[PDB]
Amino acid sequence: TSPSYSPTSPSY
Amino acid sequence: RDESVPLPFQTYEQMKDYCEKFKGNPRELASKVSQMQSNIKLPIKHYEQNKFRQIRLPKGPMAPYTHKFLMEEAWMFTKISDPERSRAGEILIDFFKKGNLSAIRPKDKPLQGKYPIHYKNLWNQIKAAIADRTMVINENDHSEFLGGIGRASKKIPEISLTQDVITTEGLKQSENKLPEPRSFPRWFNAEWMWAIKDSDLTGWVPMAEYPPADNELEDYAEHLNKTMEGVLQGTNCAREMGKCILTVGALMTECRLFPGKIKVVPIYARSKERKSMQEGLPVPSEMDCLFGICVKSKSHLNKDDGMYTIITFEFSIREPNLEKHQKYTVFEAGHTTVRMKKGESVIGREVPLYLYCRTTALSKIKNDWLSKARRCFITTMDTVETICLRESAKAEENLVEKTLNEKQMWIGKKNGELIAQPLREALRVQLVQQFYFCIYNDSQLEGFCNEQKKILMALEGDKKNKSSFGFNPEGLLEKIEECLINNPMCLFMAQRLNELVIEASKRGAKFFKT
Amino acid sequence: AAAAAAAAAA
Amino acid sequence: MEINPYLMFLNNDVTSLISTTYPYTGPPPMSHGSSTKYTLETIKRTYDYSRTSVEKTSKVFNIPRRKFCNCLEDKDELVKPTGNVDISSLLGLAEMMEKRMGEGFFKHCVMEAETEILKMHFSRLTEGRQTYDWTSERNMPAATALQLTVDAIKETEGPFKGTTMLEYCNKMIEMLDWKEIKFKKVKTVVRKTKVPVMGIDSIKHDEFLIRALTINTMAAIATPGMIVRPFSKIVETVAQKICEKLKESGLPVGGNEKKAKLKTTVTSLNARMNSDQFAVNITGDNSKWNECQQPEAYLALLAYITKDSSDLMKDLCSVAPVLFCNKFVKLGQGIRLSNKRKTKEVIIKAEKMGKYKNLMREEYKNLFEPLEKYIQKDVCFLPGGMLMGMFNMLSTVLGVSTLCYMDEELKAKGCFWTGLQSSDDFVLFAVASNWSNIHWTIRRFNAVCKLIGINMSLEKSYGSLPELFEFTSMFFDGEFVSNLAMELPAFTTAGVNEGVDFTAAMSIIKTNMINNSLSPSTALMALRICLQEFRATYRVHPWDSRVKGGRMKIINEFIKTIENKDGLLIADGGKLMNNISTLHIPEEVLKFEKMDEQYRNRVFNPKNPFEAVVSTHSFRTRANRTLLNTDMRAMMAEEKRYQMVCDMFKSVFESADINPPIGAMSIGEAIEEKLLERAKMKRDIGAIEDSEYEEIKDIIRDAKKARLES
Amino acid sequence: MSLLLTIAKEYKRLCQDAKAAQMMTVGTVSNYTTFKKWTTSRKEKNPSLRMRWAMSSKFPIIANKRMLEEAQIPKEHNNVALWEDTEDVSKRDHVLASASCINYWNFCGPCVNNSEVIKEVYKSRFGRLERRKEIMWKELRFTLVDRQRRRVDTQPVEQRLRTGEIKDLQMWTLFEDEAPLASKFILDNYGLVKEMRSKFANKPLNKEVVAHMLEKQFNPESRFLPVFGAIRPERMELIHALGGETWIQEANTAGISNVDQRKNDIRAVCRKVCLAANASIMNAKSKLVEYIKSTSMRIGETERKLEELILETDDVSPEVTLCKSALGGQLGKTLSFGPMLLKKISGSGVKVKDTVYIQGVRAVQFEYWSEQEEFYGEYKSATALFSRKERSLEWITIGGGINEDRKRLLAMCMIFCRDGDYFKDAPATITMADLSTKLGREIPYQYVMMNWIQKSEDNLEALLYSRGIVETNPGKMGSSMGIDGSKRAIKSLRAVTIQSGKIDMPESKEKIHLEL
C-alpha cells in the first residue's frame, strides 16, 4: 500500500 | 559465564546445546513480515519531500569576525628588507620603530571599546619594550588578561566541603553554559570579494625552486605550477596566508624560546614588488610589511590540553562596524599618509588611522595547522587540474591551456543574473574557499559539511534524473540545523546553499522555492 | 581605494 | 554582487569536486571539559536502546544485571535504534552464511586462528593501541601496562615462565581466584618535601575483579584493561579469518583493494540482471552501531562457530565475551561546583556524585538517578552495551551475515539484496522486478538488520539509481572518487631525521599519486611544499639563498670549495634535484654521481658521531622532561633495569636486534660463554695479554657467584 | 683490549643486582625479544610538529662524543658554543651537541676513499637509479582505462627468495661468531653466500644497516596496484611518472633486468621436465621429482638448484603449478586451464557424471559441475568475467583489448562451460583426439575438444556459431560482440556483452597443496 514515483523525463 | 547467557537457559551447557544442535527453519519470513508490520514507516519519495523546507537558518545578532586577524580592513607598513637585518624577523619591528611607527598613540577615549585603559597601557608597554628589548616586563598585568580575561578560581576540597553542605555558604550550585546563536553575516561577501582580487604586492608565500625538467611531463607540470602560482600569489588571499604562516610560525618559536614569559611578536608578511611596465628598471622591490603588533602570555603546557592566550593589535584605515567587530576594541589611533603617482594629479592628502585590538585563544594544534596554510594550494590545485584533464582526455588533445581560459565556471550573481568567470580567475574562488576552511574550521563546520554531502548527492541525483531519496529529511535538516550556531563560514555556506537550491530548482524543479 | 603598502621608513 | 562558490556545482558533476566540500586543510575538533556527561548519557542510551524490563540480580555482584536477548519490550518507536538481538534468527544467519560458502567455513577459519594464536608469544600483546593499566589505575601504552601487569604477577606469586598466549590466559583466569594481589605502586612520603617512594600495595579479590573488568573513557572511545585484551585479540583474529574469505566484507581489505572489490561486485550485479528486474542502490550509514550490539549475542555466536572446532579452544573463545557481559565503565573526571561569584569552585570525584545528589542541575539528576542501580563506587556496570572499536572485525562479520542471504526467505519476484560492509558503514544494492516492490525489498532487509540490532540511520542514509553512492568518503560514478582529502596531513615531514624525512615524504607522494590518483602537477607542488617545510623544520636553506643564519654561516665558507653546487644534499644547502620521475630514487642516490669527491667521501663515512638512506644525517631525538618529573619515573626505575640489561646483551651479541635470539639457554649463561669465546679468540691469535685474559675469567666467575646467589 | 674487560665488569655489576640477576637467569634467550619490546614504547603524538619543537632548540640532538674528539675540534669557528661536558636529559654515554657541527664535519672533515664501498651495499637503490638513466620519452594525453588490481612484483631483483632463507643469508653474511649452521640454504645456494659474505664481511661498517637493507634488496614488493597494461616488473618500480588515469609515456620496455626473461626460461625448463614425466606413464610421481631435484639451473651470476627456484618462485604458470605439485610448496589462488588462467569468486557444487552423445553414435562419460559460480577469466591481452550455472554459462562480460583475444576468451570459457552444443560438433574427433597416444591413455574430454579447437581456424568458428546468435537491441550497441570480435553490433552472440574498459582481477592470500 506504499505509492511509487515514475520520473517523467528529466529536469534539464 | 553461567550467569552471562542471554537465553532463558541459565547453565552455559544448555545454551551450548541449543547452539551446536541449532537448525533454522524458514520461519523468519513470517518473523520478518511481522517485524515489517511493527515497522510501519520509512517509505520514501523525493517528489513528496522535494521541498526540504529550503534550509533553516538561525536568527539573532549578526555573526562576528572570528578570524584571529583582520583581512579586508587591515593596514600595511612597508619596509625594504635587509637579508642580515630581517633574517631575525624579531628585530624587524626594532628596525620598524626607527621609522614613523613609534609616534602613533591612541587617545584614551576609544570608539566601540570594551576595555580601553587596559589596552592603552599595554600598548605603551609594547612601545616601551620595543626600545629596550621585545619582552614586556609586567608580572601583574598579564595575570588578569590571560585565560581570555579568565580568572584563576580557587578550589575547595570536598573533604572540608561536607560541612558547607550542612551549612550552605558561598551559595553553592552547579551550572554550565552554552554558546549564543548568531545570524547570517553580510560583511562576509565583501570579505570574499576583497580576498579574490589581486593585491598590488606580487606574492606573500615562500615557494621553493623548480626541479630540473624532462620534455614529457615536467614541462607540463612545471608550466602549470608556474601559471597557477603566478595567479594565486598576487591575490590578497595569499596575503592573509603569508601573514598567518610567518606570524604563527613566530609565535610557535616564541613558545619554545621563552615559556612563561611575555613577548612582543610582530604581525608581518614578506613580499617582493613586481613591475610589468618595462623590462629594464633599477630593480624589482624586495621588502616586508607590517600589519600590526601581537602579545603572547604564558605558554605552559598542561597534561590535558592547554590553550595560549594572545592579544592582537592591527592597524586599519577603515571605520569599524559594530555589527561584525563586536569582539574588537577600536581606538582612534592617528593619521596616516597615503599617496599615489599617476597620469592625473593624485596628491592623496592623509587619512585617519584606527587601531583594532582584541584577545583570542590559540591552541597548539591550531598554531600548527594554521602555521602551515600552504596545504590549501594543493587542495585547490587537484580540484582545478582534474577539470583540465577530464576535459582534455575526452578530446585526446592538450586542452589544459584552452580549458583554463575557455571553460566557464559559475561564480556569483549580480543584478539578479547568474554570472560566470573563466577557470583561471574562478580558481581564486576555490583558493579563498579552502583558505576560509582553514581559518574558520569549527566542529560546527565539520558537522555542516559532513551532513552536507548528502544534500549535494541528492541534488546530483535529481541532476541526472535518478530519483534519489533520503529517508528522514526532517531529521537531516535537524542535524544540519543543530550544527549551525555562531560560525560565520558555516552560516555563509548555508545561505549560499539556499541560493544554489533556488537557482537549481529554477533550472529544473526537483526542489522548492518559498 | 586600491592603495595598500603606504608608510616608508626612508 | 554576491559570490556563491556552490554555483559551480550546477553544470559540473559533484563526485569530481567533492574533495572541496571536506575542510581537511584545517585543524580537527577536539575535547574540552569533563567527559562524564557523554559517558553517563551513553550508558543511559545503552540501557534505553536495549528494550527490556527484565532485570535479574547477579549472584556474585549483588547488583541488578539486565540481560536482554531473545526478549522484547517493544516501544511504539520501532524506527528508533534497538539493542535487542534475537539469538535464534542470529544463528540462522550464521547457518545460512556457512551453507552459502563451504560446509567447513567456521571450522577452517577457527583452525587458522588456533594456529596463529597458539604460536604467539605474549610479548606481541604489547603491539596495539593504549590500554588501561589497573596497577596505577591509569591509561598507558600497551607495552608499559603489560610490563606492570606481569611484574605485579612476578612480585606476588613469582616470575612468569609461560612465554605463550595460552599460558598467559591461564594465569589471567588463575588470578581471578587469587584472594590477594600485590602491586608496584608509588606512594608519596613526606620526609616537608614529598618524595614519591615506590611501594608494594595489596588488594582483595573483590576489588581486583572490578579492576579487571574495568574499562576507561577517552575524550568518546574506550580503552579496555590488560586482562581482557588477550581474549579480545583471540576473537578478533577469528573474526579476521572469517572476514578475509568474505567477498562482501570490506573490513580486512582496504585502500586500493576496496575500490576493485566494489568494481567487481558492481559489474557482477549488472550482468546478473534480467530484462524485467530493476537495480537501485543505497548508501547506508549506521548510528550507535556499538551501543546496539551486545556481547551476549556474541557469546552465543562464538559458541556456534566453535561447536565442531575444538573443545580446547572453544572454552578459550567463550571467555572473551563474558568479560564484556559483565564489564565496568569508569565514569570520568566529574563535575564542578561554583557560585554566582565565580570565585570559589569545588571539584567532585566521580565517586562522590551520590553525595551531592540533587545539588546538580535537573538534567544531571534525571540522567543520574536511574544509573544509581548499576552504580559502584568509582564505576558503572552495564552488561549489554558493546564498547566501540574493540570487536570491529566480528561486527562486520555480523553485517556480512545479514547481507549474505538472498536465496533465503521467499522467492518473491525480484528479491535481491547484496552489497559491501565495513563496521557500521554499509552499501546496499537492491534488485526487484517492479519499482513498487523495491520499497518492500529494502524495508525487509532493514527489518532483519534491525532484527539482530543493526540500525540503519534514517537521517544519514540515502539512495538512488546505481550510479551514485558513497563508501567511507569514496564517492562513485562512471568515474572513481578522485580526492586527496584523506591523506593530506601525512604529506608533512615525518619527523625522524632529515634523509628519512625527505625520502619518506617523496615515497608518500608516489604512493598517493598511484592510489589516490592525484595529478602530476599536484604532486610537484606537493614536492615543493614538502621541501619548503622541510627546510624550515630543519632550519636549512640553499647556498644561493640570501638567507643568513647559524647553519648558513658555515655554508658561506662552504660554497667556494665545491665545484658542483647543485649536487649538494638539501640538508647541506643543496637545491632540489628530485622530480616526479625521480620520486622512487632517494635524493642521496640521484645527487651521488654529481657530488664532489671530497664531499661524497666526507659525508657518507659510517664512523660519524651523529626506503631509508642512512648517510650521516640520522640521529635520535631527546625525550622531553615531563614523564621524568612525576612518579612515572619512579615506576620507570624497573624499565631502566631492563635497559642496561638489553643494551648489555646487544653489546655482547651483535645480531640480537636483527635475528631474535633463540636456543635453550639463559641470557646470562650465553653472555658468559660467549665472553669466554671472544676472550680466547683475542688471546690465542690477536693481541691481548694472558694475565689480562685470566683477569677477564676472574671477572666472569666472580659474576657467576653473584648470579648464583640470586 | 679493555672493550671486552669493561663488558665483563658491566656483567658483574648487573648480576650483582638480584632483580636483574634472576630475570637474566630464568628462561630461554628468546626473552630478549620480549625484553626489548618493553622499552621506548612512548612515542610523541605529533609526527612533524613535535620534530619542529625539537629542532627549535639549539642543542636538542643526541650525538656521540669519542669520534668527534678523535677526528675534529669540538670548538666552533664563529664562537657559538658547541660542546660541553654535561650529559643532560636522558643519561647515556652520549653528550649533547648542536646541530650545525654535523654540517661542519661534512665540510672540513678528514675522510678519503669511501666511494666504492657505498654503492654495492645499496645496489638495490643505486640500480633503481641506473635503470632510469637509459630510457627515452614522449608525452600525450588520453582517457586511459588502467587494469585496476594486479598483484605484481615491484622493485624486482635477480635471485629473489623467501623471507626465512633471506634471514639465513642475513645471519651468515653479517657475522660468523653467532650463527646457526643452516643446511638447506647454505649447501644448495652457496656461491651467492661467497659473493655477499666476501664483499660485506671484510670491512665492518654499519652491520645492522647493511643487514636490513639486504633484506629489502632481494624482496620484490608485490602489492595490489593499477597498471595500464605493461606488466613487466621493471616498469612497476616507477609507474607514477609513466602512467595513470590521464597519464601516458613511451620508450620503456627495452631496458630491463635479466630476471624477466630468466623466469620465462624457467617456465620452458618446467615444460621439458613435465614432458619427461609425460613420456613414461608407468609412474608419474616418482620420476618427475627425480627430474626436479637432479636439474641444476645457472642464473646469470650464480648456480642454483631447480628445486629452490620452483618451490619459491613468485610467478605461477600452468607448468610451474605442475612442477610445484611434486614438491611440498603450497601456492594456491591460481586456476590454470590450457593457455587461460582463471579465478573462482563465488558459489560451490559437486562434480557429477553425465554421458552425452557425439555425432559418431558413441557414448562417452563427461564430468560436469552444477554450481552457480562466478569466476574471472584471464587471457593474453584480454580479461573477462563469467558465471556458470548448471553446466551452462549464466552471465558473461568481456573486458578484452584485442578482438582475436576476445574470441579466444569466449571460446576457452565456453569449453570450460561445456554446453550441450559441445557434444553436437564432432568432425572426425574420434580418429585422433579421442585416444591420445601415450601408452594407450584416454585423454580427458574437455581438453579433447579444447585441442580440437586449437587445431584449425574453422573449428573456432564452429563453436563460436554454436552459441545463440541474435541481432542485438539498441542500447547494447557498444556491448554487443560480433562473431569476429568487433563492436559493430549488427549480429551478436547471446548471453555475452562487451564492456568498454578492462576487468579487475581478484586476489586472495591462501596456501593449498595436495598430491597429484
Residue numbers in the entry:
A (entry chain G): 4 to 15
B (entry chain A): 195 to 708
C (entry chain H): 1 to 10
D (entry chain B): 1 to 191, 203 to 230, 242 to 632, 654 to 753
E (entry chain E): 1 to 516
Original authors' sentences:
Influenza virus RNA polymerase (FluPol), a heterotrimer composed of PB1, PB2, and PA subunits (P3 in influenza C), performs both transcription and replication of the viral RNA genome. For transcription, FluPol interacts with the C-terminal domain (CTD) of RNA polymerase II (Pol II), which enables FluPol to snatch capped RNA primers from nascent host RNAs. The structure of FluPol has been observed in two major distinct conformations.
We solved the co-crystal structure of FluPolC with a peptide comprising four repeats of the pS5-CTD heptad at 4.1 Å resolution. The better defined binding site we observe in FluPolC (site 1) runs from the P3 C-terminal domain (equivalent to the PA C-terminal domain in FluPolA/B), close to the tips of helices α24 and α26, toward the P3 linker, between P3 C-terminal domain and PB1 helix α16 in the PB1 palm subdomain. We were able to model 12 amino acid residues of the CTD with good geometry and consistent with the observed density. Overall, the CTD residues adopt an extended conformation across the binding surface, giving interaction areas of approximately 1,150 Å2 with P3 and 500 Å2 with PB1. Both tyrosines, Y1b and Y1c, and threonine T4b face FluPolC, with Y1b lying close to P3 residues Y241, S661, F663, and PB1 W457; Y1c near to P3 K657; and T4b close to P3 residues N659 and K704. The second binding site we observe (site 2) is located within a groove formed by P3 β6 and the loop between P3 β11 and β12. Because the electron density here was not of sufficient clarity for confident model building and refinement, we instead indicated the site by tracing a 10-residue poly-alanine chain. The structure of FluPolC in complex with the Pol II CTD has been obtained in a transcriptionally inactive conformation.
